[PDB]
Design a protein around this ligand. Structure first.
Ligand code: FES
Ligand code: FES
Ligand code: FES
Ligand SMILES: [Fe+2]
Ligand SMILES: [Fe+2]
Ligand SMILES: [Fe+2]
Lengths: 191, 441, 188, 438, 449, 188
């Protein structure tokens, strides 16, 4: 319906509508440096699978969304499955997902994967609201589990909304997955 | 082979190249196989491209409201005539030599037909189309393809199973709304998933404890498992109540409950209302599966149901592409559709927290089927049968169960047995033979 | 490499000097900022915007690499590149995507130019930096085939033109002898 | 099989494991297959390593200007004696146990031959060499290998086609200069490209609009398609004019035109001079292909490309694309020619880009079980009763050997597949094993 | 096939899919194949999971000291019951339906056996276990599996070879300590490595110059090559000396040399002591190999030995997984172990500077075996034989060589010939046929360390 | 991991403190500049130069990873690494390539060490940093085989020595159990 992916997302009604303005900040600009420091620390949390810590860096009005991508013709005006996403999460769903890992009864991840979230191509934007940044990144996930199967890649882009609360926190995440058909056993991870 | 008929399963059938090559010339050449729902192409010109194994088909809606399936191939030298997954077009240009097709399949442009081919005597253009699927049919808007040109109809095939199918796919005169699919490759044999959904209640407590423990849900053995025609399924026993009490106890609104009664039969109603069995999971042979569950809602202690349709598309003896769809009645409240989808995403599909652990089980089983030990093992699928062939428990009577086919209560392996019985029946069929089409004649 | 390229006669000959700049050096921060913004452009296939960031005397070159013995003194196919482009050819290449009749990229690939290992050098000319980067391109198209990687190193010559940096030379060292991608209907 | 002979193509032949296995034991075990040009190893010691499917050969220039092809294998326990693609060496050491070979093949070092093997009676070292290719030959400096030790000669195979091949590969007494190849893997059956270049004019308008539109170029149906011996090709009709005018209209300088007449026959000249047909694309059975075009310059200037369709599987090919130009061409001409090459064909070619999309997409449909039920139509040029749509060009209209026509047609594809089927029915090549060291 | 028996090798046997499938049904269906050492599971509940080709086995230690191998499969619907490579557990839960098994294999939990299966008449639980390997045995704490349920015993199979195996694996009454494995994939046929280690001295000068040149080492032709039973090996000729002098000359301590004499027989001693042949490499049919070397130590000019045990696990016709282990006598000084391992890391295994080059050679030979030329070549492996079949040099006499089997000095290809003769004998055996087990219608292994 | 390593007795025990530094902190910028310069060295296979940026008490360690259950309290092969090197062994490894008689790398590989996710810590000693990076190595050799990825994390200990930082400790957390590369005749 809308024209972010966040606005088109079925469960994106309560999501923050803050958007970017200006060109990107310089790479010595304090706000950029903060954003960068944030995304790299996340990465180390997500590698170690510190999902409780990670969640405390996520606002209570978070929209965490990664739509299904579909291959489409050039002037079709879309490239995601209408009304279908891989992830379309609020804070409650995200925390209940993490709760799951915490029970240690999430069999598909005992034993655990080996995760390496590679983060690159970071760049920051001022927004149309006070305590808010827009951060684009590229994230390549490398994953390996057990002693038979080859490892999987997952390539994506992200637009994030960061929000100042005392510390920076994650208010919106839109993941642009670079594959139509995923090649991973599951998405019992986070991007 | 005789072993399957006694409920003992040669473990090698889930990772054997030869059995796959065979399955392809039998099961997948002679079965009705799901490709799409109508509701996925509502407008004129709307299309999805879906596959029967490695065969690509355009499913599109014409400008009279009708639906067609077209082999995704230009009639000249083979180029696919539509290389996107979905979209909207009123025609399809082939970029090799510029032949073009109306979205109902009728050829339009064939450059230099007169000068270069010598007209109709050189190549037949008059009333040519993109090739139709060998056989196309549908039921409740669910569109199937069969590779056998002489198959029975989809309705003859599905038989009494349409009775159960309806609960999933016809809850109103309005029809069904299906979205998706999410698509992802798993290293498990197509068969394991279908069996699970067909009649595996036994797994639920163990595999999915995590999902009970995190408080996502509000007697498992008390459910009925049923089989009719080519399909079968699982159910939950509800508390005492009427049809409206029980529908509502499961999260359906009164007006949705009322619209249900307009399209369900007295019998179909009685299974929920009197017997108190509500659909859970089901499979249709060979690779179509359903699940219906009602987790607790986010803000409080009500429950709300979701429906998933899924196709186990086979890639090899040891790889499947799961196509998971979300489905909900077209007339359900807009708030209801959102919640139902939310539960869906959390429970099944590419990020489902049930599916995660199910696929682990299946992938692991695919792993043991790889070795040489697996060609020496008959796994045991005989639960519900003693050693002398007598039943552990009894069939449900017509008084206890009002739906067609046969039903029981308790954990059992009856439906797995029947699925694999069907599999064996199909493996022994002769290879489908079909005369070659000479395109342009 | 630029000097050995068949079509490199008109190419800028500026080269690095000294050791790499610190990572807080303004001139490094600009060079980095440039390369990440290019990436965003090349992902979105904004080839026209991209092309306006490229000087009119550009040499854009990516030789064919060949596996050779240790003291052979060359590791590229003599007189044969993948890309050997000036501004004319690069624009006519982009013009082609602009027609929307470039069939191999309708539908479009899904692209992810990952850029890493950036470092900057002062040159032997006024308004010129040399920038080294590593680039890993991930590419997926359609719903059957697995995705491709392309790995490469780059040396770039950036040139100051107003309040803006621009690309004057690009040498791409591709990390494969035989390419595993359907085509190079993309840019690096 | 009887279908191919009627111009109807079983759809599954472009993605069938069994047919690939068969091809390997027939087509690729019995044909002359290109590997390299002389000009790629000009100096003594120069070598390239090139493959015939999965067999690795060293093609090297010796120190008398001669050329050899040696199976890339130490005679002891089979290690590859040369693990680089190209370079310059007067010998190849084997690192496993230190046997060494002159670059003409003759063995030099065989350690502890006497003490260990027991001399000659234990192992034959006297006048041994790296194994020769089963059959080696060349034409216009183009070097071919044939895996059948009893093949006919290359000249005999190529027959009348040498007449056309000469336009692409002998424009001067100086010889040809080829560079490359660009190498990349594509998910398309090896045959589809061979066919395309053999005689597909039809595709050009539609596949390559993008390239006209961008003004890269300055009557397509008016071109002749010819077939002679085991190969065939496409051509462009040129405006009226003499040999020199027409050669020049296409981008050849005057002194290049003059050098061409030294090496081309009157008959080879008349095809350009009188008939007005200038080579475009061509294929030689099975997997060798040529293209000649003259885009606008950054005036027009021609480029040439030679390419091998090396088959990896039933659904994968390695394209090896070469640039070629006459050696005596002006240095400026060479640079412009190559620039057009880079822009049109090869690993970055804007033509090839779209051509490979077509082929790749065909290979996709060939994958399924529907493919095993379709015969595609390749009968353009033939009516239902078998009568020709249009007539053969007469000897007055066309002065080159074989048979020719004008107009869009599918004659050449039909003949290439006919050859493919004649070869697929041959019996498996059988060759006595060599006992190395006897 | 008759060609092998003449020491002429059809080139295609190192990259041929049909021959691999055949090997699988013969060689790998009938042979004792190594999985693990006892010292890798010292405590109760310790376990490794190891693979015979694509079959997964839990090798675990019970709470009485005994060792079991169990097919890694739940008895219900076939899910692997342990999804880690190693660890410690006194039971394994299957997460599909919750059946549970003690670590000696015996079933504990079977949910709703009574209500759902109908008790014992439905499914047999009484005294059930995870499935035993078809055949299990060990020697010097090296545990083997054999998929033929009617194979001969390991000891029968190994025969006279145990004489040499003891040099590598029984240096004390304390037993052996093996650690690892390092595991990595190489694109080389399983066979080539096995043949190399079996008796390729000839390669060493050329392949491994780099390692001498960098001064990591302190007459190669003078070594003996020996073959007994199903295995063979390479050795180094040592300077004149007694047993203690020659063991010491190679880096063993004196109390280590003494502890060896407690377990080696007079004959086993005499091969080192009198004959002056110290073990180097060795292979056991089909895919087990050893290497024993003594590089110079870091801080000085002493030398110190290391041992490696490796399995060549075959993945396809053209891929192998190397499983490289380190091994040292358990009673060796703690300082000796560290140095021995250091040398091991530098020389063999995933980061080995020898192995690097050896694997190059093999991978490159696999490459030539791929093509159609290789189906028309017989490679020559006749070194040591003349054209009329007469020997180049003589057998060593009993006075010159005190160990069982046969042995010569000089570069030769006798052991490769004998390894391939075995391969051929195996390849012509009939398909093993085994009645199927209907699940539901283990003898602890005594330690040997 | 450095403390559990068999040959780690002589290794520095300095560990991190505080939270990570800001990305404009001089010390972070030095550490980053260092890892990127190493990358360009390891790509160009300049192993001698590389070796001069390594302290004489280096511990350079890359254990074998093994898939284990959640509460098992280890995920490496007890007493078995891929690399467990000191300066002496590292230099003898390099000496070997220098001979040009390391056959498995003549012809050479093509290497690209991608370094990302760099973050720095203050330590409990004076002239010492702890530097976390992710490293992805892409490697291609010859004209037949597919390229290989090696993924890993590293913790490094940097030490100030003159006007220069040097590598005192490296622990490599390889992200695979079974390696898919021909060898580790490279450095990470
Ligand atoms: S294949 Fe479509 S126009 Fe020729
Ligand atoms: S393989 Fe070349 S000398 Fe042995
Ligand atoms: S498969 Fe393990 S308990 Fe069911
Ligand atoms: Fe489940
Ligand atoms: Fe073309
Ligand atoms: Fe060796």
């Amino acid at each position: 319906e809308g024209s972010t992916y966040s606005e088109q997302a079925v469960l994106g009604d309560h999501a923050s509508r803050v958007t970017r303005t200006g060109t990107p900040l310089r790479f010595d600009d304090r706000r950029h440096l903060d954003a960068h420091q944030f995304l790299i620390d996340e990465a180390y949390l997500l590698d170690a699978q510190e999902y409780q810590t990670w969640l405390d860096n996520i606002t209570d009005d978070i929209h965490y969304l990664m739509p299904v991508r579909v291959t489409t013709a050039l002037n079709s005006g879309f490239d995601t499955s209408p009304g279908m996403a891989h992830f379309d999460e609020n804070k409650y769903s995200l925390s209940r997902r993490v709760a799951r890992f915490v029970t240690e009864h999430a069999w598909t991840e005992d034993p655990p994967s080996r995760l390496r979230h590679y983060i690159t191509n970071i760049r920051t934007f001022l927004t149309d609201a006070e305590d808010h940044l827009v951060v684009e990144s590229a994230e390549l996930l490398f994953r390996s589990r057990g002693d038979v199967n080859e490892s999987a890649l997952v390539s994506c882009g992200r637009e994030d909304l960061l929000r100042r609360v005392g510390e920076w926190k994650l208010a919106r995440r839109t993941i642009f997955v670079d594959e139509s058909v995923m090649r991973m056993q599951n998405l019992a991870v986070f991007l | 082979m005789e072993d399957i008929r006694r409920g003992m399963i040669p473990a090698h059938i889930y990772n054997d190249k030869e059995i796959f090559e065979r399955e392809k010339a039998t099961v997948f050449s002679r079965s009705w196989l799901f490709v799409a729902h109508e509701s996925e192409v509502p407008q004129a010109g709307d299309y999805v491209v879906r596959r029967v194994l490695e065969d690509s088909f355009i499913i599109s809606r014409d400008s009279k409201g009708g639906i067609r399936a077209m082999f995704n191939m230009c009639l000249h030298r083979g180029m696919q005539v539509c290389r996107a997954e979905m979209g909207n077009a009123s025609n399809f240009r082939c970029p090799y030599h510029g032949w073009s097709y109306r979205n109902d399949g009728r050829i339009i442009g064939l450059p230099f037909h007169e000068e270069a081919y010598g007209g109709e005597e050189g190549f037949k253009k008059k009333g040519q189309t993109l090739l139709p699927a060998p056989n196309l049919d549908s039921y409740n808007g669910m569109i199937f393809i069969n590779m056998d040109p002489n198959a029975e109809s989809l309705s003859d095939y599905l038989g009494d199973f349409k009775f159960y199918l309806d609960y999933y796919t016809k809850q109103s005169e309005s029809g069904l709304e299906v979205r998706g699919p999410q698509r992802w490759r798993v290293k498990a044999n197509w068969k394991i998933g279908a069996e699970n959904f067909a009649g595996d209640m036994y797994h639920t407590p163990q595999t999915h404890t995590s999902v009970v423990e995190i408080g996502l849900f509000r007697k498992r053995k008390d459910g009925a498992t049923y089989w009719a025609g080519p399909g079968g399924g699982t159910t939950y026993k509800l508390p005492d109540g009427t049809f409206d009490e029980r529908m509502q106890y499961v999260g359906y609104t009164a007006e949705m409950t009322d619209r249900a009664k307009e399209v369900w039969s007295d019998e179909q109603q009685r299974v929920i209302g009197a017997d108190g069995f509500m659909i859970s999971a089901a499979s249709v042979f060979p690779n179509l599966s359903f699940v219906h569950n009602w987790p607790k809602v986010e803000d409080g202690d009500d429950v709300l149901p979701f429906i998933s349709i899924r196709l186990w598309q086979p890639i090899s003896e040891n790889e499947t592409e799961v196509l998971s769809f979300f489905a909900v009645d077209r007339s359900a409240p807009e708030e209801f559709k959102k919640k139902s989808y939310k539960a869906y995403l959390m429970c099944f599909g590419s990020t489902g927290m049930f599916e995660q652990d199910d696929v682990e089980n299946w992938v692991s089983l695919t792993n043991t089927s790889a070795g040489s030990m697996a060609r020496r093992l008959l796994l045991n699928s005989r639960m519900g049968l003693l050693e002398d062939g007598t039943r552990v428990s009894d069939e449900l009577t017509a008084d206890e169960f009002h739906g067609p086919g046969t039903a029981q209560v308790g954990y059992n392996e009856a439906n797995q047995r029947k699925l694999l019985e069907m599999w064996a029946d199909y493996l022994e069929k002769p290879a489908l033979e079909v005369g070659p089409t000479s395109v342009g004649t």
